[PDB]
C-alpha cells in the first residue's frame, strides 16, 4: 500500500520470525 | 539536615580572601548552594553543586568538596549576607552571614 | 577433558588445570574486516604475534572490603607492548580481545566472581547531576574499582548482567574464566584513544571466605588482542 | 525570568493568608518547581512549599494549600490560622529540583523574585 | 541456528527414568551458559501441542509504538518585553529519546539500534486569561516544523529569513488538521545508533562523556507562521516518535534506579525499599516468610 | 473522481497504527548495514537467559548481600532454608530478573520457568538440599513432609555445583495475568521452598556458612501477551538538563 518512492517510508515489518537463542543461551 | 553555616559574622577588608564554612548534620553529597542576599533585596544564587558558578555572576568565588565541611572562598572583596542551602532532602537554608 | 585448556597465541601460552569451557561472545569469533565491510581505502597493517600475544595486567588483591574491579579495552592495553605502539602510531584499529581471568585459592576457600564483559559500558556518577570526567573514566592499565557494583555503576541491575558475555569463577569448581570477544562496534574501525569497545568487570558476588590463616588471594587478568589491524599511520602522540 | 507577587501585607488577623505571584519570562507549564520561601525574623529563610505544573504540591507545617494556574501564569499559597509567627518577607521562587519520588533533591533557587512583607496584626 | 520459530515449542510424553551417568538436572553455571534441560527430563510430562504464538514479543512489535519524546508550550502573544528568550512564537529542540523515561528505558535494552523514525506533531491551543476571564475562541493557526540537521544554523527568531527552507525539510500543518506525520530515515554515519557510548566525542580532553554526536538525529524548529492576534494564546506541541524497520543488537539489563538527567547515566536511587541503592527489591520479614500467602 | 466514504475513526492518531508515512528526506541512501554480533529479533530470546534473583530481599541485607542465601550447619533435622514467592509480574525476588523485567511489559504470560541454584561453598563442604514447588492452592508449606508432596528435586553438592528445578506450566487456562499484586486464582503461580535434605557438613578450616545463589530463566514454552506500560520506571517531572535541549 506504499505509494512513496523511498523504501524506508513503508509500514513496519512484522514477519521476522527467525530468532536464534543459542547466541545467549549457549555462547561457546 | 540542619546546616550550621555560622562560625561568626566575619569582617574583612577590600581585596581579602574571606572564607565561609558550612557544616551539615548528615553526610550529604555535593548538593550545596551558596546564596548572596544583599541588604534590602532578594537573595541570589552564587554557586550550586558545591563547586559550580552561575551565568551573570562575578567570578570571585569558589566551592569546596562534598561531605560535611563545605567552605566558600571570596578571592577579592571589592558585602552581603551569605546563606547555605543543602538541597539534598529538601530546602533547608542554614542560617549564616558575613 | 573440558577442564584442561591450552591457549597458544603467538609466543605466549596459557595452560589451565581447572577450566570451565571457554565461551564466545554472542557465538562469534573475531575476523579480519572483509572487503565489503571495509570503508577506509588504505592498506591496513596486520601485526600478528607482535600484537595478539596475551598481555597480562597487574593483579589485584581479593579481600572482604572489595566490591569489584573493571578495565576498559583497549584503554587498559593502550600503552603496553607493540599493541600500544601500533595504537599510538595509528589512527584506527579493530581487534578481538580474548580474555583470561586467573584466580586461585585452596579447597577450604569459598568465593564467586562474576567475570562479565559489558559492551559500551557507559557508567554514571553517583549522587550528582554532573557527568563523569576524563580522569574518572580513563584509568588505563590500573583499571578502576566499583563502588556500587550492585547497580554496575550505571543504574542498571547486576542480577541481569548474565545477558552479557560472562563466566563465573566458583572456587570449588574452576579457577579461570576465558571469554572471546568479537569486534562489537557499529563502525568498522574506531579511534582507540577516546572510545572503549568493551569493559571487563570482575565483581565478587560471594565474598572470599575461609577459617584458615587467610592468605593473600590475587586476581590476575590476561588480555590478548585477536586479528587486530590498524589504519592511519601518522606520528606517535 | 521575572517573578512578581502581590497580596495584602499589613492586614491579616487570623484569616487565610492568600498571596499570588505572576510569572513573566518563563511558561509555568514547562517545569521548574514554583514555591514560596519566607525570610522570617523568627527563623530566617524558611521554605514553605512548592508545586509542579502537574499540581504536585510538596509541602513543609501542612496547612498551606499551594495551587497553580497556568492559564493566568501564576501560582498562590494560603497560610491558614496565621498568628503572629508568620510575619515574614515571603519570596516567590522557582527552583530546579527533582521531587520524582515524594522527596526532592538538588533543588537550587535560581530565580527569586521580590519580597512581600506580610504582617499578622490586630 | 536460525530456526524460524512462529509459535511456542511443544512437549512430548515422558516415562520413568533411572539411567545413571546421564544427569539432565545437574549443570554448570560456571560455564556462562543456560541449563540445557527440557521439562521432559526433570518431571514426567504428557504430550502437549502448544499453539501460543510469539509475535507480540518481536523486537519490532516491542519497540514500534508511538511514544512521547517532547512536550513544549510557547506563547502566541506579541512579545514586546525583553524576556521569554528563544521562545517568542517559536521553539527549537534537539531530538533526543532520553527525556521521557518510558521510551528511554525501552530503547536502552539494546546496545545498538537501527530504525527509521516516524515523527508525529500534535498541537493544541488555549486562550490566556492573564488580564481577563474571557474566552473569545480558538483560532485555526498554521505551524511550521523545519527539520534542521544537527550542527546547522537554526532560525534565531520566528520572523527571520531562515524559515524559507531552501533545502531544509519543512512541514506546514494547521491545528485543526490531523497530526502532522513524517518519516526520518536511518540517518546515522554508522550502521547503527549507539544507545550507549563509552567514549568522548572529540579529540580534546573534555569532550562530554557518553554523548555521541552521530546518535543525534538533528534539530526540530517549530514556529507559528501566522502573525500575532490582538489577544494571546498558549500553543503546546507534543512530538511522538515511532521506530520503524527496527534492528537491535547486544541486549542489556534494564534500568532499575530512577533516571537523574538526560545527558548521563547517573543514579541516586529512591529512598525506601523499592528501587533504592541498598535495596532494589522491596524488603520482606525474612527469607522464610511469605509476603502474602493464602490462609483459610 | 472516486466516490469516497469517510468512516468513523478517520483522522484519529492511534499510537499503535501501522501505516506508511511521508519521506522527509527524499532519495536518501542509508548507511550500508554491516554485521554486528548479538542481534535480537524476538524478546523471548533474552528471557531464556538465567539471572540472579534476590531471595534475600530483607532489611539486614544490603547491596550484593541480597543476591545470595547464606545457609549454615543446623542441629535440627528437616529444616526450612528459604522460600521464594513465584510472583513473576509483581514485586518480589523475581521482579528484577530478565524474565521478570521483560514480563512486566506484558499482561499475560504462559509456559514454564526454570530455577537454577549454584552452591558457592568450599570444595570440602558437603550437603543435600530439596527444592520443592507447590501448585497455587493452599498456604506455603512450613514442614518438609508437606512440601515434598509437590514437584521437587533432591540435590547433592558435588562437582556439578548447580541444579535445575523446573516450575512446570500448571494452570487451567492458557495464560496467567497480572491484574494486581494480588492472590487470585488466575494470577498465582505457587510457592518454591528449600529444606535441608540431610545437612550442611563442613570441616573446621572451611568457613561455617556457605552461600547459595539462585537463577531463573524461561523455557522454549514461555510466551507473553498484551503488552503494557512497565511499572518499573516512572517520572514525576522533567529530568535534569531537559530544558537545555530547547536552547
DSSP per position, chain C: -TT-EEEEETTEEEEESS----EEGGG-------TTT--S-SPPB--BTTBSS-EEPPPEEE-SS---EEEEETTTTSSSHHHHHHHHH-SEEE---EEEEEE---TT-EEEEEEEEEET-----BS-SSPP-HHHH--TTS-EE-S-GGGTTTTB-SGGGGGSSEEEEETTT-SEEEEE-----SSSSB-TTTB-SEEEEEEEEEEEE-SS----EEEEEEEE--S-EEE------
Rounded Cα gap, residues F112 and E45, in angstroms: 12
Asked whether E293 and F191 are in contact (CB, 8 A), the reply is yes
3-state secondary structure of E76: coil
Spell out the domains of chain C, with CATH numbers in brackets: 1-237 (2.60.120.20)
User: Cα separations (Å) of F17 from A11, D25, E61, E124, E242?
Assistant: 9, 39, 11, 21, 10
Domains and CATH numbers, chain E: 1-296 (2.60.120.20)
- Nearest Cα neighbor of C157 from E292, F64, F46 is F64
SS3 F227: strand
Residue recorded with cell 591496513: C44
CA distances for F39 relative to A11, A20, C198, E111, F212, angstroms:
21, 9, 17, 10, 33
Please tell me the total number of residues recorded for chain A in this structure.
28
Distance CA D76, CA E133 (A): 18
Distance in angstroms (rounded) separating the CA atoms of residues C161 and D17: 55
Question: Can you tell me the distance from the alpha carbon of F36 to that of C186, in angstroms, rounded to the nearest whole number?
Answer: 7
* Contacts with F97 from chain C: Cβ below 8 Å: 159-160
Report chain breaks in chain F, C–N > 2.5 Å, as residues after which they occur: none
Q: Which of E84, E58, E90, E57 minimizes the C-alpha distance to E72? A: E90
CA C68 – CA C116 distance, rounded (Å): 11
- What's the number of CA atoms in the CB half-sphere (13 Å) around residue C42? 13
Q: How many CA atoms lie within 13 A of F48 on its CB side?
A: 25
- C-alpha separations of C127 from B89, B91, C121, D81, F180 in Å: 12, 17, 19, 39, 33
Residue E88, classed as helix, strand or coil, is coil
Buried b / exposed e along E201-227 (16+ C-beta atoms within 10 A):
beeeeeeebbbbebbbbbbbbbbbeee
- Mapping DSSP to helix (H, G, I), strand (E, B) and coil, where does residue D51 land? strand
Check if the beta carbon of residue F111 is closer than 8 Å to that of residue F221: yes
Contact C219, C102 (CB under 8 A): yes
Report the alpha-carbon distance of residue E89 to residue D49 in Å, rounded: 32
Specify the number of domains making up chain D.
1
Q: How is residue B97 written as a grid cell?
A: 552571614
Report H helices in chain E.
39-42, 59-63, 101-107
The CA radius of gyration of chain D, in Å to the nearest whole number, is 14
Chain-chain contact of C108 with F122 (C-beta, under 8 angstroms): yes
Grid coordinates representing E158? 520566528
Which residues, at least 6 apart from E69, have a Cβ–Cβ distance to it below 8 Å? E95, E96, E97, E99, E100, E103, E239, E240, E241
Which residues of chain A are within 8 Å of residue E55 when distances are taken between CB atoms? 14, 17
Count the alpha carbons within 13 Å of E32 in the hemisphere toward its beta carbon: 33
Contact E196, E113 (CB under 8 A): no
Largest CA distance in chain F: 94
What 8-state DSSP symbol labels residue F245?
G
Q: Which three cell numbers stand for residue E211?
A: 554523548
Touching chains B and F? (3+ Cβ pairs < 8 A): no
Query: Taking Cα atoms as reference points, which of F136, F213, F128, F219 lies closest to residue F173?
Result: F136
Strand partners for E70: E239
Q: Which domain holds residue D3?
A: 1-122
Alpha-carbon distances of C177 from A10, C128, D74, E145, E283, rounded to whole Å: 46, 35, 62, 54, 34
d(Cα C189, Cα C227) in Å, to the nearest integer?
13
Query: What is the CB neighbour count within 10 angstroms for residue D4?
Result: 14
- The verdict on a CB contact (< 8 Å) between F116 and E29 is yes
E158 secondary structure, DSSP code: S
**Residue numbers in F near E281 (CB within 8 A):** 54, 57, 66, 91-93, 95-96
Tell me which chain D residue has its CA closest to the CA of residue F242.
D31
E255: helix, strand or coil: strand
Question: Is F247 within 8 Å of chain D by CB?
Answer: no
How far is E191 from E114, CA to CA, in rounded Å? 7
Q: Is C152 exposed, middle or buried (0-12, 13-18, 19+ CB in 10 A)?
A: buried
Are C111 and F213 spatial neighbours (Cβ–Cβ below 8 Å)?
Answer: no
- Assign E30 to helix, strand or coil: helix
The residues, any chain, with a CB within 8 Å of residue C34's CB and separated by 6 or more, are none
Query: CA of E137 to nearest chain F CA: how many angstroms apart?
Result: 22
Listed by start position, the domains of chain F span 1-247
Q: What is the largest CA-CA distance in chain B?
A: 37
Question: What's phi and psi for A7, nearest 5 deg?
Answer: -75, -25
Taking every pair of Cα atoms in chain A, the longest distance, rounded to a whole number of angstroms, is 46
**At how many Å resolution was this determined?**
3.1
Nearest CA-CA partner of F133 in F83, F181, F80: F83
Give the span between the Cα atoms of E162 and E145, in whole angstroms: 12
What are the distances in angstroms from CA C160 to CA B75, E259, F164? 50, 18, 18
Nearest one of C24, C190, C19 to C104, comparing CA atoms: C19
Give the chain E residue whose CA is nearest to the CA of C196. Answer: E198
- CA–CA gap between residue C69 and residue E270 (Å, rounded): 25
- CA dihedral in degrees (F195, F199, F205, F206; nearest 10)? -30
Q: Across the interface, do A8 and E4 touch by the CB < 8 Å criterion?
A: no
Radius of gyration from C-alpha coordinates of chain E: 27
Contact D52 F239 (CB under 8 A): no
Q: From CA F53, how far away is CA F47, in angstroms rounded?
A: 14
DSSP, residue by residue, F51-113: -B--TT-SSS--GGGGG---EE--SSSS-EEEEEE--SSSSSTTTTSHHHHHHTTEEEEES-E
Mark yes or no for CB contact D100/F240 under 8 Å. Answer: no
User: By what technique were these coordinates determined?
Assistant: cryo-EM
The whole-angstrom separation of Cα C22 and Cα A28 is 7
CA atoms of E62 and E107, how far apart (whole Å) = 10
Taking the C-alpha atoms of residue C164 and residue C201, their distance in angstroms, rounded to an integer, is 11
C-alpha cell at E147: 527539520
Query: Which subunits sit against A, judged by 3+ Cβ pairs under 8 A?
Result: C, E, F
d(CA E290, CA A8): 52
Verify whether the Cβ–Cβ distance A24 to F45 is below 8 Å: yes
Helix, strand and coil percent figures for chain E, each rounded to 5: 5, 30, 60
Comparing CB atoms, the residue among F32, F53, F120 nearest residue C110 is: F120
CATH class, F1-247 region:
mainly beta
* CA neighbor of E195 nearest in space, from E121, E254, E244, E278: E254
A22: number of Cβ within 10 Å: 17
C-alpha pair distances (Å), E236 with each of E91, E132, E210, F60, F239: 11, 21, 31, 49, 19
Contacts of E236 in chain D (CB under 8 A): 29
Please state, in angstroms and rounded to a whole number, the distance separating the CA atoms of residues C171 and F124.
11
Distance separating alpha carbons of residues B76 and B54, to the nearest angstrom: 18
Q: State the Cα–Cα distance between residues D10 and D108, nearest whole angstrom.
A: 30
**Peptide bond preceding D48: is omega within 30 degrees of 0, i.e. cis?**
no
CA atoms within 13 A on the CB side of F108: 13
Cβ atoms of residues F155 and F129 within 8 Å: yes
CA angle D87, D93, D97 (to 5 degrees): 125
The DSSP H or E segment spanning D92 is strand D91-96
Q: What are the structural domain ranges in chain A?
A: 1-28
In this structure, the strands spanning D46-51 and D58-59 are antiparallel
Query: Rounded to 10 degrees, what is the CA torsion of C138, C125, C144, C54?
Result: -60
The residue with cell 520506571 is: F233
Q: How far apart are CA E200 and CA E206, in angstroms?
A: 8
Nearest CA in chain D to E76: D27
By the CB < 8 Å criterion, does E39 face chain D?
no
Closest-CA distance of chain D to residue F242, Å: 10
Residues 6+ apart with CB under 8 A from F158: none
Give the CB-side neighbour count of residue F119, counting CA atoms within 13 A: 29
Grid-cell match 592498506, residue found: C43
Amino acid at each position: 500500500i506504499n505509494f512513496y518512492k523511498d523504501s524506508y517510508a513503508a509500514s513496519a515489518s512484522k514477519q521476522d520470525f527467525s530468532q536464534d537463542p543459542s547466541k545467549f543461551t549457549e555462547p561457546v | 539536615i540542619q546546616m550550621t553555616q555560622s562560625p561568626s559574622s566575619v569582617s574583612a577588608s577590600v581585596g581579602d580572601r574571606v572564607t565561609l564554612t558550612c557544616r551539615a548534620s548528615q553526610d550529604i553529597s555535593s548538593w550545596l548552594a551558596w546564596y548572596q542576599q544583599k541588604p534590602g533585596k532578594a537573595p541570589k544564587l552564587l554557586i550550586y553543586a558545591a563547586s559550580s558558578l552561575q551565568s551573570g555572576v562575578p567570578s570571585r568565588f569558589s566551592g569546596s568538596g562534598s561531605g560535611t565541611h563545605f567552605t566558600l572562598t571570596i578571592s577579592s572583596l571589592q558585602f552581603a549576607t551569605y546563606f547555605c542551602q543543602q538541597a539534598d532532602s529538601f530546602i533547608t537554608f542554614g542560617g549564616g552571614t558575613k | 577433558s573440558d577442564r584442561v585448556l591450552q591457549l597458544k597465541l603467538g609466543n605466549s601460552a596459557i595452560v589451565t588445570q581447572e577450566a570451565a569451557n571457554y565461551c564466545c561472545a554472542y557465538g562469534e569469533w573475531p575476523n579480519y574486516l572483509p572487503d565489503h565491510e571495509a570503508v577506509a581505502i588504505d592498506k591496513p597493517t596486520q601485526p600478528e604475534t607482535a600484537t595478539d600475544r596475551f598481555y597480562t595486567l597487574k593483579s589485584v588483591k581479593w579481600e572482604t572490603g572489595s566490591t569489584g574491579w573493571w578495565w576498559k579495552l583497549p584503554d587498559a592495553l593502550n600503552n603496553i607492548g607493540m599493541f600500544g605502539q601500533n595504537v599510538q602510531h595509528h589512527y584506527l584499529y579493530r581487534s578481538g580481545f580474548l580474555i583470561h581471568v586467573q584466580c586461585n585459592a585452596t579447597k577450604f576457600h569459598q568465593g564467586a566472581l562474576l567475570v562479565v564483559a559489558i559492551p559500551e559500558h557507559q557508567r554514571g556518577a553517583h549522587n550528582t547531576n554532573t557527568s563523569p570526567g576524563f580522569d574518572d573514566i580513563m584509568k588505563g592499565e590500573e583499571g578502576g574499582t566499583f563502588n556500587h557494583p550492585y547497580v554496575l555503576d550505571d543504574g542498571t541491575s547486576l542480577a541481569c548482567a548474565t545477558i552479557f558475555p560472562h563466566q563465573w569463577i566458583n572456587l570449588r569448581t574452576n579457577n579461570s574464566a576465558t571469554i572471546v570477544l568479537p569486534w562489537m562496534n557499529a563502525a568498522p574501525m574506531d579511534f582507540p584513544l577516546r572510545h572503549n569497545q568493551w569493559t571487563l568487570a570482575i565483581i565478587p558476588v560471594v565474598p572470599l571466605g575461609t577459617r584458615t590463616t587467610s592468605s593473600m588471594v590475587p586476581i590476575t587478568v590476561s588480555i590478548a588482542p585477536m586479528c587486530c589491524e590498524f589504519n592511519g599511520l601518522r606520528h606517535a602522540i | 525570568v521575572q517573578l512578581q507577587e502581590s497580596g495584602p501585607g499589613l492586614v491579616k488577623p487570623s484569616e487565610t493568608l492568600s498571596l499570588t505571584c505572576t510569572v513573566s519570562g518563563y511558561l509555568i507549564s514547562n517545569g521548574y518547581y514554583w514555591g514560596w520561601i519566607r525570610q522570617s525574623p523568627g527563623k530566617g529563610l524558611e521554605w514553605i512549599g512548592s508545586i509542579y505544573y502537574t499540581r504536585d504540591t510538596y509541602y513543609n507545617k501542612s496547612r498551606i494549600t499551594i495551587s497553580v494556574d497556568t492559564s493566568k501564569k501564576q501560582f498562590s499559597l494560603k497560610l491558614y490560622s496565621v498568628t503572629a509567627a508568620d510575619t515574614a518577607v515571603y519570596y516567590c521562587v522557582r527552583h530546579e529540583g527533582s521531587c520524582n519520588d515524594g522527596s526532592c533533591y538538588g533543588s537550587f533557587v535560581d530565580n527569586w523574585g521580590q519580597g512581600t512583607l506580610v504582617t499578622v496584626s490586630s | 541456528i536460525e530456526s524460524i520459530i512462529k509459535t511456542a515449542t511443544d512437549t512430548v510424553k515422558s516415562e520413568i527414568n533411572a539411567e545413571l551417568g546421564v544427569v539432565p538436572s545437574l549443570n554448570a553455571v560456571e560455564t556462562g551458559a543456560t541449563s540445557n534441560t527440557e521439562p521432559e527430563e526433570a518431571i514426567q510430562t504428557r504430550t502437549v501441542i502448544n499453539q501460543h504464538g510469539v509475535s507480540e514479543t518481536l523486537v519490532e512489535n516491542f519497540l514500534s509504538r508511538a511514544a512521547l519524546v517532547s512536550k513544549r508550550s510557547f506563547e502566541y502573544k506579541d512579545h514586546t518585553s525583553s524576556t521569554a528568550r528563544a521562545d517568542k512564537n517559536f521553539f527549537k529542540w534537539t531530538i533526543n529519546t532520553r527525556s521521557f523515561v518510558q521510551l528511554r528505558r525501552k530503547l536502552e535494552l539494546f546496545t545498538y539500534l537501527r530504525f527509521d523514525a516516524e515523527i508525529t506533531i500534535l498541537t493544541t491551543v488555549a486562550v490566556n486569561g492573564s488580564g481577563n476571564n474571557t474566552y473569545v475562541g480558538l483560532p485555526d493557526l498554521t505551524l511550521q516544523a523545519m527539520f534542521v540537521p544537527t550542527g546547522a544554523l537554526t532560525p534565531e527568531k520566528q520572523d527571520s529569513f531562515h524559515w524559507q527552507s531552501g533545502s531544509n525539510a519543512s512541514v506546514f500543518f494547521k491545528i485543526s488538521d490531523p497530526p502532522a506525520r513524517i518519516t526520518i530515515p536511518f540517518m546515522c554515519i554508522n550502521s547503527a545508533y549507539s544507545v550507549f557510548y563509552d567514549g568522548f566525542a572529540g579529540f580534546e580532553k573534555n569532550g562530554l562523556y557518553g554523548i555521541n554526536p552521530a546518535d543525534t538525529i538533528g534539530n526540530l524548529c517549530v514556529r507559528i507562521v501566522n502573525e500575532h492576534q490582538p489577544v494571546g494564546f498558549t500553543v503546546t506541541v507534543r512530538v511522538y516518535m515511532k521506530p520503524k524497520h527496527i534492528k537491535a543488537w547486544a541486549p542489556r539489563p534494564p534500568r532499575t534506579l530512577p533516571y537523574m538527567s538526560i545527558a548521563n547515566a547517573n543514579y541516586k536511587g529512591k529512598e525506601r525499599a523499592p528501587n533504592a541503592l541498598s535495596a532494589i527489591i522491596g524488603n520482606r520479614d525474612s527469607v522464610k516468610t511469605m509476603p502474602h500467602n493464602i490462609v483459610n | 473522481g472516486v466516490p469516497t466514504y469517510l468512516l468513523p475513526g478517520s483522522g484519529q492518531f492511534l499510537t499503535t497504527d501501522d501505516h506508511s508515512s511521508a519521506p522527509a528526506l527524499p532519495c536518501f541512501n542509508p548507511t550500508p548495514e554491516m554485521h554486528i554480533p548479538g542481534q535480537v529479533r524476538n524478546m523471548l530470546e533474552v528471557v531464556q537467559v538465567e539471572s540472579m534473583m534476590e531471595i534475600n530481599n530483607t532489611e539486614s541485607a544490603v547491596g550484593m548481600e541480597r543476591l545470595k542465601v547464606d545457609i549454615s550447619a543446623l542441629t535440627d533435622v528437616d529444616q526450612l532454608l528459604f522460600n521464594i514467592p513465584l510472583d513473576i509480574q509483581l514485586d518480589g525476588p523475581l521482579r528484577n530478573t530478565l524474565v521478570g523485567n521483560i514480563s512486566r511489559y506484558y499482561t499475560h504470560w504462559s509456559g514454564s520457568l526454570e530455577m537454577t541454584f549454584m552452591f558457592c561453598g568450599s570444595f570440602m563442604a558437603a550437603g543435600k538440599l530439596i527444592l520443592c514447588y507447590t501448585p497455587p492452592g493452599g498456604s506455603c508449606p512450613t514442614t518438609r513432609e508437606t512440601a515434598m508432596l509437590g514437584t521437587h528435586i533432591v540435590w547433592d553438592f558435588g562437582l556439578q555445583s548447580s541444579v535445575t528445578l523446573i516450575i512446570p506450566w500448571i494452570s487451567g487456562s492458557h495464560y496467567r495475568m497480572f491484574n494486581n499484586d494480588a492472590k487470585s486464582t488466575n494470577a498465582n503461580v505457587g510457592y518454591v521452598t528449600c529444606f535441608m535434605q540431610t545437612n550442611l557438613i563442613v570441616p573446621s578450616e572451611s568457613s561455617d556458612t556457605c552461600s547459595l545463589i539462585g537463577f531463573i530463566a524461561a523455557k522454549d514454552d514461555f510466551s507473553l501477551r498484551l503488552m503494557r506500560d512497565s511499572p518499573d520506571i516512572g517520572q514525576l517531572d522533567h529530568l535534569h538538563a531537559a530544558e537545555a535541549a530547547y536552547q
